[PDB]
Write a protein that binds this DNA or RNA. Structure first.
Lengths: 17, 63, 93, 46
RNA sequence: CGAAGGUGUGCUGUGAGGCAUGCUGGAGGUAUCAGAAGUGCGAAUGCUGACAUAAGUAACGAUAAAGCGGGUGAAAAGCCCGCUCGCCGGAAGACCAAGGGUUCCUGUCCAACGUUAAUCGGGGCAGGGUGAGUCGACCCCUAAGGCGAGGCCGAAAGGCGUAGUCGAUGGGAAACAGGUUAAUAUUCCUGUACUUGGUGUUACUGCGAAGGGGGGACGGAGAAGGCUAUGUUGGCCGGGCGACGGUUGUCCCGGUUUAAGCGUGUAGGCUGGUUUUCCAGGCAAAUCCGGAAAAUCAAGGCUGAGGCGUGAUGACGAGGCACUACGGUGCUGAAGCAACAAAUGCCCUGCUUCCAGGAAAAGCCUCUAAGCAUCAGGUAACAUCAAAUCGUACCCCAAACCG
RNA sequence: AGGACCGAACCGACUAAUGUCGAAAAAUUAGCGGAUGACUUGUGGCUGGGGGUGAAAGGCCAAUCAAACCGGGAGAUAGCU
RNA sequence: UAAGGUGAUAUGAACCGUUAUAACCGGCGAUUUCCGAAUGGGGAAACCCAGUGUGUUUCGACACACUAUCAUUAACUGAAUCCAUAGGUUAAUGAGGCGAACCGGGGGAACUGAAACAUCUAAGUACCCCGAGGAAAAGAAAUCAACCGAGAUUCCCCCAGUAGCGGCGAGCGAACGGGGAGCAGCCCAGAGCCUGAAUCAGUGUGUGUGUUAGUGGAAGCGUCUGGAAAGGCGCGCGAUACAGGGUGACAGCCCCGUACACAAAAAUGCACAUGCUGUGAGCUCGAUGAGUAGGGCGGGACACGUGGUAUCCUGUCUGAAUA
């Protein structure tokens, strides 16, 4: 299984998540 | 495990290729899909073994 | 011959979903991923040889990939084909 | 007012498709120029 | 134990600038004399990036119109449930075709967008979703048109064109009812079927074409008849008698639906049939078409909606009953009839007239040529096999298409 | 029967008003002419730039037409700003 | 070569091997889906539809190879008329397209200058097509020169802004000759003597040399500041290596490296010896290039633009001699 996708560091105006 | 099967005639190496294709490939891929597979190097090594067996078959049969 | 190897190559992996579970429990069908071509006759032969079961009929469909944006870079997922193999009154898995 | 562009896949493919370009000698030169420039999309296609 | 750049100061020369230093800075700079400059910017409606300005101003994008009770949430007029008011309703409704490509459903958040907030969305992330022998594409043929073996022409490139090949905007074979998910259904489930070919059995038989004949195969305008979809009333079924007068009554509310296939084949339209003999015609032949003669009856033959029974003592069905993650799920289920009117839709590519005289080919029925007729092939019935591949979500008079 | 009449869809914009840094780089409302044809439209092709087409206005040829757009001659030349 | 790796964004999970088949690089091989000259037919690119011959679990349906055009050669069929040809069928070899510039040829302008503009210049430049090579073309005078003499072509420097051409305007602009780079001469049109006789092309062996993997390769510390020292001070060593990169501030002696010495199982480019196949030395005589030279008509290139216009070519009409 591959849950981890390694989300990258986003932009200063990025989705708050 | 590269020269062990180099001295095996066509029929037995074909049988070995059939065994490798039937077992250790479908079971491993279905287990990986269902999440039951824990070790992933099995898929890579079995695929490499199948490739080596096919290469030996091509080298022997025909030319 | 390589008909048997084509049968052992067409199938890729099963598919899991709420619709899959509903179809299995009600319609006695299992939905599984198949190769890009994975024609109906080849899939039927492969499932018959592998699962040693009986299938009334097999229908398949092509699922288009999704466009996902990782960071600033867009990308299309690889398209995969799913087939609903319908088993007869006697089913094992 | 209906604008100039009315999309149509058939018209687009038969007017600017790769086979249409290769049908004429000059279209082959256009494709060669596109390849030399290095654009990812040589022609319009699905 | 502090270069350059940046940031102030005191001196210095008629001056471009030079010197030292307060602070950030952090590892680079460079004496004097010569060598070369893309070597000094203040304007060229000079170009690129940022910021003033008008200015917290116009405007916030058809004058169809919102409110209230409850729910989540920190924030409620815009998010969700319920009751009112209003708009479209030949559409501002439902299907599609072209065009977009997951915008479709669920979970999850307000980083950026919605000309405001938004917990919301056609927004961000994750997951799910597209099931075809009968839908369309695919495939057979082809019109306009394109390509074009040979060939003609042209300095070359190239232009034209035959046999042939592409080219649907057209002609060819087949499915309907109900039910289901949060998303597919004429694809899945229940029932009834239908169509094209291969294989084997049974009884017969002459089969056999890029060749011939029929059909395919067609304009405009207009009237009537039968119909149907559809809707009105009545009867029947279940309920009601009701917060402001009366309402067991000629009263009110909701239902009163059922396909394709199968057999009968009607209304209507078309056409005279049966048999024999012959013919340099149909670029060969022909039992096929056409033409010429006769004997016979006058009816036959072709097409043909709709209705009627099977389909179907099956589904559906108002309403009630039991639980609700309180959105919703399970059981049940009475009647399911008559008349009227009726279409632009069917009989109808029908019928009557008019000049503007109203495609082609393939599938399809028939004839034989070459060759074979102890075969093969075809016919009629039976059983079986296959009918592959591609799109199947969503919008489609719009927020998703072109602007 | 009517290149017939009134009049829906459909075609066009003849008049008025708003819109000119508008919702729209010619738009919206009511009137307006045709609405069986010399009509319109979906689809599929042909006519390509001294050329095509044009019931003909020097009109249209993808918001550009008394000679389109794209790259080159080309940094054309300018007794001019 | 080898004890670090399973490529990076980009961590993680699970594994491989550590003295050799962990990992990496190189030489030779196998697979190499579809489109793309696409080449079985078609087509909208990654797609559809097939025929033939070889072998096969349920007839079912599968796997492999072939199935385009032209040119040349070979064979079999084959009419309008006997023959025959045309045409048709099959076997073998070559091409079909993609490439920045250079080469030759067939085409081929305009802007602009002359202060306008038509001759001209721009210019055989912009640009199109064809063909092939690593260079290509050309090349051994029916040449020059001057009656003195040089003997292949090509490239660089003078002659050269000279003589000349040019509405003698703009502007264009050589040649003989001199100095340098490099120097090779042949073959057919035809017979006799001798006939591997020299030089070459095609394939093996050996030697030499270079590449495709790489290896060995010298030497500094203590102290002070300073986060960290390679920096201040002290005393040392190597150097055929202080050429360079990194190393917590500037390193010859910290590492990678450099000078210098080595390395190749396999394939390789080039210089030779040794082999095999192929054309082919030297001597005697003859021959020595015909629709061509030339000319009429109109042009193009030669600095030469038709002028007194020499020279070569070409569209049409003519057209000899040959030593």
């Amino acid at each position: 299984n591959n849950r981890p996708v390694y989300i990258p560091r986003p932009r200063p105006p990025h989705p708050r998540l | 495990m590269k020269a062990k099967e180099l001295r095996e005639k066509s029929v037995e190496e074909l049988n070995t290729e059939l065994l490798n294709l039937l077992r250790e490939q479908f079971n491993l891929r279905m287990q990986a899909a269902s999440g039951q597979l824990q070790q992933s190097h099995l898929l890579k090594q079995v695929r490499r073994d199948v490739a080596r067996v096919k290469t030996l078959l091509n080298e022997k049969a025909g030319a | 011959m390589i008909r048997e190897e084509r049968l052992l190559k067409v199938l890729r992996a099963p598919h899991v979903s709420e619709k899959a579970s509903t179809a299995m429990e009600k319609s006695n069908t299992i939905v599984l991923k198949v190769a890009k071509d994975a024609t109906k006759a080849e899939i039927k032969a492969a499932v018959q040889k592998l699962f040693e079961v009986e299938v009334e009929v097999v229908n398949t469909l092509v699922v288009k990939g999704k466009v996902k944006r990782h960071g600033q870079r867009i990308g299309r997922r690889s398209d995969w084909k799913k087939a609903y193999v319908t088993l007869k009154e006697g089913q094992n898995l | 007012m209906k604008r100039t562009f009315q999309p149509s896949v058939l018209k687009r493919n038969r007017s600017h498709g790769f086979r249409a370009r290769m049908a004429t000698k000059n279209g082959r030169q256009v494709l060669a120029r596109r390849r030399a420039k290095g654009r990812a999309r040589l022609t319009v296609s699905k």
